[PDB]
């Protein structure tokens, strides 16, 4: 009012935008000194400015001119910069962020939060699906499957930003929820975790050991089968390598699809995991007459 921060980590971070009579336009990358960064961060109510950056996107645009480090001394100009040029970005002192660590891939792991330039963990006391649902939506992983307690994933280090969290469910961020700070009540043994809908975990059931059997995948909070139509050595090489059982040896004939859903994959061969490949979940055109794909790796007792 009349400044805001969009497409960033929080409401106190991201690309700078200025309000006009027509619509909100991004601020100019040039003419963006640290004086204007302080004035904008302080006016929004986000404390001081930690760092100012200039990002490039893949009539003219407005700019923010300030004679001092205050909002009263700042002035907006209508046209004084090239339109399709580098924009202005900023991270204030009150900026917060969120990350999941040690969870065998993206959209899962230990819930870590950023507060005043320090990555800290959240306690498992009063941790439920209502708190996990807020975490999965802000990151872009859909809904929450399981709100895990401590010791499921590796415990964190450093500070503990929350000893108790009680989200209603509709909050945009985890920091907006009512809670209690780090008062030495909880410890790193109780570091909370989460499993979101978009996370992908794999295993091989049916065979002699862990690196042999039916290719199963945990997507959308349910175990699913893999289509044998597009299951060639390129896909099998990525699977046996990610699980850690060497190269692929054989791809036996599958059984009918007997789980919640069906998964499709199309790898080049050099991927680190099957989630990095091109995939489509529950596609009737690609998967119909197919069977549940299988694989036999090198490290198994069967080979
Ligand atoms: C936790 O949040 C719910 C609303 O989701 C509220 O009814 C309840 O009183 C809160 N717990 C405490 C201890 O205030």
Residue numbers in the entry: 43 to 100, 122 to 366
The authors write:
CD6 is a transmembrane protein with an extracellular region containing three scavenger receptor cysteine rich (SRCR) domains. CD6 expression is mainly restricted to T cells, and the interaction between CD6 and CD166 regulates T-cell activation. We have solved the X-ray crystal structures of the three SRCR domains of CD6 and two N-terminal domains of CD166.
The X-ray structure of CD6 is the first structure for a protein containing consecutive SRCR domains. The structure reveals a nonlinear organization of consecutive SRCR domains of CD6. Despite the interdomain interactions not being conserved, the orientations of each domain relative to its adjacent domain are very similar, both burying approximately 270 Å2. A consequence of this orientation at the interfaces between individual SRCR domains is a nonlinear consecutive domain structure, resulting in the three domains spanning 78.1 Å, a shorter distance than if the domains were in a linear arrangement. There is a disordered region in CD6 domain 1 in a similar position to a flexible loop in CD5 domain 1 (Garza-Garcia et al., 2008). There was no observable electron density for the other potential glycosylation sites in CD6. These data were mapped onto the structure, clearly identifying and defining the boundaries of the surface of CD6 that interacts with CD166.
